[PDB]
Each structure stands twice: as structure tokens, then as C-alpha cells.
Design a protein around this ligand. Structure first.
Ligand SMILES: Cc1ncc(C[n+]2csc(CCOP(=O)(O)OP(=O)(O)O)c2C)c(N)n1
Ligand SMILES: Cc1ncc(C[n+]2csc(CCOP(=O)(O)OP(=O)(O)O)c2C)c(N)n1
Ligand SMILES: O=C(O)C(=O)Cc1ccccc1
Ligand SMILES: O=C(O)C(=O)Cc1ccccc1
Ligand SMILES: [Mg+2]
Ligand SMILES: [Mg+2]
Lengths: 536, 536
């Protein structure tokens, strides 16, 4: 077992922050997998299918800052394509490793399984190009520096990378690196940073009341502490949108709720949109996050910070890392901003479900909500400290949440994971519940059983049959997907029942599946406003 | 509800042979779905996820000659990418309809859900290019003739097509066609056909023993009957490979078993490879079908017929329809082939499982086997007449078989569907069993429970844990995926038990799940030949 390219890739994987490898085996990656098994730093996590494996890696990377997925050539990598695209859309650094046929087999154009039968072995590599920031076909002549380049770009951009690893390449000799891969910090040209600073100070110095709006790019680049630190030194009205929920302790002074554009609570609208200067840190104003682009923030009202560029008014200042832009704004805010922010009983409904769940969440929770009433209702939760809130509203792929929960629980085995998934969403990735059971995880899974696609019903054709789903027996699923499930399940239809059951499960001693019976047409407040804005 | 582009697409869809549309709804395709619901000719089939929906359409198209899949922009189409690629690889005409945001939203580059957040709406259209034979972005200015062009190319090439249907384009006015969409058989230039006939006539005239080898491309282009009649009218040693199994009634004289390169029964090798002239009709010599490319067929020994070109010896004759080449060769065989033929108890094992199943299959059966010991064992079955044998050994995506069975059973509600899936494979697409139960289908599902990836174990690392799987309670799955599964399930470990159970479920009055307990290391004969031809 001499040190080879496969070992080099695994060593670089640990350098980037991953302690587990998700995926599904195939004959093209079995020999690479031997090095994963033997590795003392990387844990193989076999998944029920590649799409779930890619979802799990995404959720894993949202907890550890990095993740890796292993698939087999063609059938595996294409199954995971939607997950990688979601990681690209929401800036999640998931490394897609594709085990591939040997280079000699590729060069002869053989009619191998997992190919289109045309002897071409680069179709799927090119198909991955739009959803990755870097990729490489690893050869004997490029492997180690291509691995470093892709991972480095992945770390810089916080977005997926792709490596095609032919089985013969994996075995090629390599030498262990003396230093851990860490390309680290970049600094703006001091004149460029000074110009930004000067422009931001002029704007901030003339601001009567400043507000702060941070979102998911703060999370992805590891600036959550800095933003928390920011609001503590510099009290001001602050909020996130749905994607970046969890950046702030929502019980802190100056926080009035999540910002949603026009769908926002009245206090939130006044706190953020009423400020003459709003600092938008890592924000993307997507249709869902702004309830149909109904946000009212003018360019002259805002200072914007993006990963490599920041904007003051109409002027953009490019080639500035967001970290330096934030440090600049923090210093400036300490000088020029002086605001002192002034502070169950019946049939289950969306309203009393979320109120009941609000009393249940605790610090340290990992909360995942899928698209549908789960995410659009969970936006109203008042998150305590140290909560990792995982939602995917830009990509919006239902089924992500259940499989991502498995990755998150793998990342943080000692943290309580709460899964908020619709009945429709859970059908798409249900087989990863077996992975949770196999690995003895103890998530609290709440299935919002409204018997179909309620969000779709609220958008169009509520009585149409395409909005119906096959009606599953949810409390029986753990017993079918495990020979001895360490789990308990309940079906609740009353608010007192749910609160009583949530009381029972509180310290998550086993996996909990709570089937929540909800009305077919019941809608959380945010989604009602999103539907109200969909008309023309 | 005036007639519009959406109705035109559905009208053309029925013309091509699809009576059902598979997929998953999304807000971008709800209004088109109203036309599917309202249509009296096409039935909406909601699926548990898009990947299973694409698998189901593939199996549906293998029974009706055409199929359609409907997904939503981005999250849906990318989830279905592996299914479409498999349809492209094995020449299955599946139409992928992608409901998309309105053109105005696309033109403004809005930050819409199901996008990468870059305002780009053509990434996923271009990613589908390598795995479709034709595509179009439907506009108000091109919709109807782009629809016709894509379907016509699909009909000609027997391969998937792609249509992006912006929600606004679907509502644009159209006129119902007086002529049903059809693609009239091409005709070879009479000199080119004559040149091939004269070269083939010379080749056959000096051949003492001729054998016939047909495979899946015969099935896709609708030449099954032609090959059947050809061997009836001219008896000769004939065979198929694994992909084209089912072309022949395997009980007629001159059929000795499926051809698998070096892995043949002695009679099959002598029947096919021993012939001085072998007619290869629609054959692709992939690694799995040839047991590692160990087939011995020389160019001078073979006459080969492909969809648009045929070969005699070293000379290719292009621009000849496959039908005309066969017709020509049928004429010639009558002229120059003047010849005729040549001359369960105890613990369940792979050997006695397939022996037991051999006595169970009947005419009219639709048999689907997934990659693994299921497909590699089912190759030894001697099929009776009118059997549709669905295997996917070129693409080889496990999980296809279970979801494809749902599509096939939808296609043929009055035929008995036998599903041969491994435990590993069935985990990937298990949620489509709920679709089977919701639609009151009655397949006989045999899950080969060898507790993990046995074929992978036989290839590499039998004791390695990446070849293990989560151990499910298979007979309990219908009770979890339905509120009233009228299903009958058994766990069998004895052959006498299995035969008794197979007698019980023979007339498929209910869905049957037979969990077949097989040894972890038990191997079908073909896979042993595939393993021995590796790293040699
Ligand atoms: C993979 C995928 N397919 C389709 C969609 C379209 N879509 C968006 S919300 C939704 C319904 C979700 O329903 P459910 O999970 O039951 O949530 P509910 O609103 O009913 O609470 C669908 C199908 C998607 N987002 N992702
Ligand atoms: C979607 C997909 N993922 C991974 C593979 C790689 N692969 C090929 S055969 C196989 C084993 C299949 O196991 P099972 O379905 O239980 O059949 P068995 O060979 O175990 O009888 C695997 C993992 C594949 N072919 N398709
Ligand atoms: O291992 C894989 O990638 C498979 O898909 C299973 C397999 C193994 C050997 C030949 C064909 C398929
Ligand atoms: O319908 C879809 O495509 C969805 O993904 C659900 C949805 C509906 C409205 C806003 C965001 C997501
Ligand atoms: Mg629902
Ligand atoms: Mg198995």
C-alpha cells in the first residue's frame, strides 16, 4: 500500500475540513474506496442513492464548511447532478469525486457500461461545467496540482468542484504533502480598499439610522461570528432573509424578525426598509426571499458587500474580499452609527404548529426546512443562539432536507437535528431515512402531512389531481427501512398532542418521526403573500 | 380554454404513441398540467421523484414505442438527467418536457427559484445536449414546428428529445392539425441498396452455415416481428445478446441460448461463433454483453445492420434504413441459406432460484431485471413467446428496474409484470412502489436479498464495508408506502417455499413482494465469467 494519488486526494480532503465521504460505490471507484476505508481521517458514508448522497454532502458542508461526494462514472455522477447544482446555486463547497474507467479504456473508446455507447468518456465531465467553479480530469501528469487547484478554487469561491478520477490514476504514486492545503486569505489592493473605505465612510457619516441585513454568503465564507460580533459592538436594527437565517441570535435586541420584502412583519419592514442606510452583507434578493421582488431598498440607500466586490451607492469597488469589506464597515460603524435599538388547544393548523414548534427549539439545534409550507412557515421561528438553520430557497429542490439532515447529523453527531419536511418532499428522498437508522442517528423528523403538494395547491389548481400524492403510512416507514429501528413514531392531529409528543422526544434518545396532520389548504403567512404577489 | 401550444404538444405526443405523461409538478408547469388533466388522450401519472419518473417513462417507452416525461425547470430536469442519459444510451425514445418560467422572466435575468442565481436560464438546456437527439427552446415564433421536428427526430433515431416550455409559450394560440404526426419510412437510394444487396448476396452465396444475431436496436425500431418471421421463414441458428433478449420466442428450434461472448453455453458459441457467416442485426458489443469483449466475431465473418448503415465484410454501405437492409437480407437468406437447426429443493441459491423462476414465466410476461445478479442470472432464462424482457446493461443504472416496472405496468395494465431487482438496486428508487400501490398495480416483485452489493463484492472487496447496505424490512415496505396496500409479501429462503409462493401469485390479483434470501457470495454463471475476465 504505497502512497498514491488516491491517498493524496483524501489527505487534501481532510485539510479542507471534511471527515466523511458520502456516495455510492461502483466498480469504477472500488479501488479508490479501499483507501477511504483504510484512511484514519475520512469516514466512508454509503448512501441509499447518489442524489441523496449529494444532498447529504451539501448539508454536511453547511455544518463543517466543506464536504465531498463520491460517485461512479455516468450513472452515479448524473444521479447527483441536481444536488451539485443546488450546491452551486447556494454556494456550498461540495467536492464531486467521480470514479472513472481507466485511461487506457477511455483512450480505446471501448463500449463500457455507464457510457452512451459511443466511446466518448467526457460528456458528463462537460455537463458538470455549469454547476462547478473548477474541475479537472486527473491524469498521471497533473493529478496532485489539479487536485490542489480545484480544492483551492472551491475554498476561494465556496462552490462545488469536480474531479474525474480514472482508476489507474488513483493508483499512481504520489508523495505526502509537508503542509496542509491552505491557500488562505487574499487582500485587496490598499488603494482599492481605501477608495471603498472612503466611499463607505462618506455614506455612513451622513446616515441618521443604519440597519444591517446579512444573508447566506456570510455563512458560506465563515463570517457568522464576525456578523454576530458586529451587532454586539454596534447595536442597530438587523435582520437576515430566509437563506441566511441563523446568522443572528434572534432574541437579541435590534432583531425584529426575518426580512422577506413586503411579506415582512411591520416592525421588520420599518427596522430595515425604514433605515436611511442599509448594509447588505452577502445578500441575494431572490424571488422567494423577497416575496416576489417586493423588497424596497434603493441603491443610494444601501451599501452592498459581495464575496469579491462591494458597492456604495451606484459605484462598485471590485477586487475586495468581503472579509476586508466587513472589517472596514465594522470599524466605520463603530465611529459613525449611534442608533440604540428600542425593543395550543385544538385541531392542528399551520399557525399553532409553528407556535408549538417555537417553544420546542433550543440553542445548539440544527433545523432543516424543505421547500413548501415547512420552509415558508419556519421563517417565522425566533431562533435562539447557536442554531444552524439549513434551508434551500434559491435552488428549492424538495427532498433535499431529509437527505441533508442525514449529512448534517453525520457532521454533528452530538447536536440535536430537527427535520421539517413536507409529505411530498420526503417521498423524493425517503430511502435516506434508512441511512439514518443504519447509523443510529436520532433526528426529530416532523412530516407535515397535508396530503399532497399544498404550496402548489395554493399557487394553482388546489383541487387538481396533479397536486395529490400517494398517501404513505409514515409511522410505519422506520419499521420497513430497518430490521430493528432505534426510533419511535407518532401521528398527531391536535396541538396538545404535538406539544405532548415534542415533550416526549425532547432529548432525542431515538430517531423520532412525528406525522403532523395538517389541512390541505392551510398556508403559512409568508406563502400567502408570495401567492398574493404572483398575480401578473 | 382555446386551443394552444400546450394542447398541440399533447396532440403530437399521442400521435407518437404515448398515452401517459410521467413526472413531478412544479409551479413552472402547473398550467400546462391543466391541459394534461383536461386532455382525453393522455393520462397524467404523478411520480414520487423525477429520476423514477424518467425511469418509468423509459420502461413505458419499451412497451409502447414512445414516452414522455414532464419535469420542472432546474430541480426537476436535473434530477431526471440520469434517466434521460440511460434512454439515450439504450436508444429509448423518451420526450423530456421541461416546464420553464415565462420568457419575460428569463429575458430579465430574474433571480428565480430553481436557477443558479446568475440570471442564466439556458444552462440546463445545454447540459442535456449530449444525452438527447434533438432539442428546442419553444418560443411563440417556433413552437409547433420545433415540437414536430424534435418528435420526428425522436421517431427516426429512437432516442430522447428535449423541449423547454416556458409557461407563457404554452398558452400561445395554436391550431389543431388535420394530419396526425407520423414519420414515413426512409428509402435507400436504389443504387446504394443494390450495392449492399450485391455485396451481401456474394457474401451469403459462399457461406456454408449462417447464423443470426439480433439485439436491442431491433426492438427499438420495431423490427421484432420481422426478425421473428425471418427465422420462421428461414430456420437457422439464431440468438440475441442480453440487451435484445425477448426478440425471439426462445423455445423454437435453432435457439440455444443468449450469446455472451466467451460466457456461452457450448452450443451457443458453436451456433454463433462457429458460423462462417453471422448476420448481426442491431448489435452493440458492449463489455457486459460480451463478458469483457471476449466475443470472437471477425469482420469477414459478419454482416452487420445498424439503423442508418449496414456493413458487409470491411465495406460499409451508409444511408440504408435498417428495415430495408433486413428485407434485403431476408430475400437473400431464402436464396442462399438452405439449412435447418443442427440436431429444486433446500436452501435458496442463485442456481435453484433461476431454475425455479424458469418454470414460472409464461407467454405475455414483462420481465425486468436490474444490473447485478438479477440481470446476470436472468440471461439464462429460456423465454417463451411474447415476452418483453427489459434490461439496461449498457447504461447500467441500478434502481431503474423497479421504477421502469411501474412505467411498463402503466403501459400494459393487462400483462403480468415480473420485477427482478437486487436489494441494493431497489433502495435507490423504492418510493415508486408507493406509486405502484396508489395505481392498484399488481406486479410480482422479487427482491434478491443477499444483504449488499453482491456483484461489487465479486468484483472487489467482498469483506469491505462499502459493499454493505442498510438492511431493510422488505416485506413491510408496502404497508409503509400505502394506507391500504392490498399486497401479499413473503420472505423465502427455501426453493419449495418460493415455488409455492410463485404459484400463489401467478394470476397477480394483488401486488406481490417476494423477498428472496440468497447467500452473500452466491453468483450466477455469467457474472463468474465477467469477473474472471478482469485484470487478465
Ligand atoms: C425535485 C423537485 N421537484 C419538484 C419541485 C416543485 N415543487 C416545489 S414545492 C413542491 C411541493 C412541496 O410539497 P410538500 O413537500 O408536501 O410541502 P407542502 O407545501 O405540501 O407543505 C414541489 C413539487 C421541487 N421544488 N423540487
Ligand atoms: C445508480 C447506480 N449506482 C451505482 C452503481 C454501481 N453498481 C453496479 S452493480 C451494483 C450492485 C447492485 O446490487 P443489487 O442491486 O443488490 O444486486 P446484487 O448484484 O447485489 O444482486 C452497484 C452498486 C450502478 N450500476 N448504478
Ligand atoms: O459496478 C458498477 O459500476 C455497476 O454498475 C455494476 C456492474 C459491474 C460489472 C459489470 C456491469 C455492471
Ligand atoms: O413549484 C415549484 O417549482 C417549487 O419548487 C415550489 C415553490 C413554489 C413557489 C416558490 C418557491 C418554490
Ligand atoms: Mg404536503
Ligand atoms: Mg444485493
Amino acid at each position: 500500500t504505497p502512497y498514491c494519488v488516491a491517498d493524496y486526494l483524501l489527505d487534501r480532503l481532510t485539510d479542507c475540513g471534511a471527515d466523511h465521504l458520502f456516495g455510492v460505490p461502483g466498480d469504477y471507484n472500488l479501488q479508490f474506496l479501499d483507501h477511504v476505508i483504510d484512511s484514519p481521517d475520512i469516514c466512508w458514508v454509503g448512501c441509499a442513492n447518489e442524489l441523496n448522497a449529494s444532498y447529504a454532502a451539501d448539508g454536511y458542508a453547511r455544518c463543517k464548511g466543506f464536504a465531498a461526494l463520491l460517485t461512479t462514472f455516468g450513472v452515479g455522477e448524473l444521479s447527483a447532478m441536481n444536488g451539485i447544482a443546488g450546491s452551486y446555486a447556494e454556494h456550498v463547497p461540495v467536492l464531486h469525486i467521480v470514479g472513472a474507467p481507466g485511461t487506457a479504456s477511455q483512450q480505446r473508446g471501448e463500449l463500457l457500461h455507464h457510457t452512451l455507447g459511443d466511446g466518448e468518456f467526457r460528456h458528463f465531465y462537460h455537463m458538470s461545467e455549469p454547476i462547478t467553479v473548477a474541475q479537472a480530469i486527473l491524469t498521471e501528469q497533473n493529478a496532485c496540482y489539479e487536485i490542489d487547484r480545484v480544492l483551492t478554487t472551491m475554498l476561494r469561491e465556496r462552490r462545488p468542484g469536480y474531479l474525474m478520477l480514472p482508476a489507474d490514476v488513483a493508483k499512481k504514486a504520489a508523495t505526502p504533502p509537508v503542509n496542509a492545503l491552505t491557500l488562505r486569505h487574499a487582500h485587496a489592493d490598499s488603494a482599492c480598499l481605501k477608495a471603498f473605505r472612503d466611499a463607505a465612510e462618506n455614506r455612513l457619516a451622513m446616515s441618521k439610522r443604519t440597519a444591517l441585513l446579512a444573508d447566506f454568503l456570510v455563512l458560506r465564507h465563515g463570517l457568522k461570528h464576525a456578523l454576530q460580533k458586529w451587532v454586539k459592538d454596534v447595536p442597530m436594527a438587523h435582520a437576515t432573509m430566509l437563506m441566511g437565517k441563523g446568522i443572528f441570535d434572534e432574541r437579541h435586541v435590534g432583531f425584529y424578525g426575518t426580512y422577506s420584502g413586503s411579506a415582512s412583519a411591520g416592525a421588520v419592514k420599518e427596522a430595515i426598509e425604514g433605515a436611511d442606510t442599509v448594509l447588505c452583507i452577502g445578500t441575494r434578493f431572490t424571488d422567494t426571499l423577497t416575496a416576489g421582488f417586493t423588497h424596497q431598498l434603493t441603491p443610494s440607500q444601501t451599501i452592498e458587500v459581495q464575496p469579491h466586490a462591494s458597492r456604495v451607492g451606484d459605484v462598485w469597488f471590485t477586487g475586495i474580499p468581503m472579509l476586508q469589506a466587513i472589517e472596514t464597515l465594522v470599524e466605520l460603524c463603530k465611529q459613525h452609527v449611534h442608533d440604540t435599538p428600542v425593543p395550543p388547544d385544538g385541531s392542528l393548523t399551520q399557525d399553532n404548529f409553528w407556535k408549538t414548534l417555537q417553544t420546542f427549539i433550543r440553542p445548539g439545534d440544527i433545523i432543516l426546512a424543505d421547500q413548501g409550507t415547512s420552509a415558508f412557515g419556519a421563517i417565522d421561528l425566533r431562533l435562539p443562539a447557536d442554531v444552524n438553520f439549513i434551508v434551500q430557497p434559491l435552488w428549492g429542490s424538495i427532498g433535499y432536507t431529509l437527505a441533508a439532515a442525514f449529512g448534517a447529523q453525520t457532521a454533528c453527531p452530538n447536536r440535536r437535528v430537527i427535520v421539517l419536511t413536507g409529505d411530498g418532499a420526503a417521498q423524493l428522498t425517503i430511502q435516506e431515512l434508512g441511512s439514518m437508522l443504519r447509523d443510529k442517528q436520532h433526528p426529530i423528523i416532523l412530516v407535515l402531512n397535508n396530503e399532497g403538494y399544498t404550496v402548489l395547491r395554493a399557487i394553482h389548481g388546489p383541487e387538481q389531481r396533479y397536486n395529490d400524492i400517494a398517501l404513505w403510512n409514515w409511522t410505519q416507514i422506520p419499521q420497513a427501512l430497518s430490521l430493528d429501528p432505534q426510533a419511535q413514531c407518532w401521528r398527531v392531529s391536535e396541538a396538545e398532542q404535538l406539544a405532548d409528543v415534542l415533550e416526549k422526544v425532547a432529548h432525542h434518545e431515538r430517531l423520532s418521526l412525528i406525522e403532523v396532520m395538517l389541512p390541505k389548504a392551510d398556508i403559512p403567512p409568508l406563502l400567502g403573500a408570495i401567492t398574493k404577489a404572483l398575480e401578473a
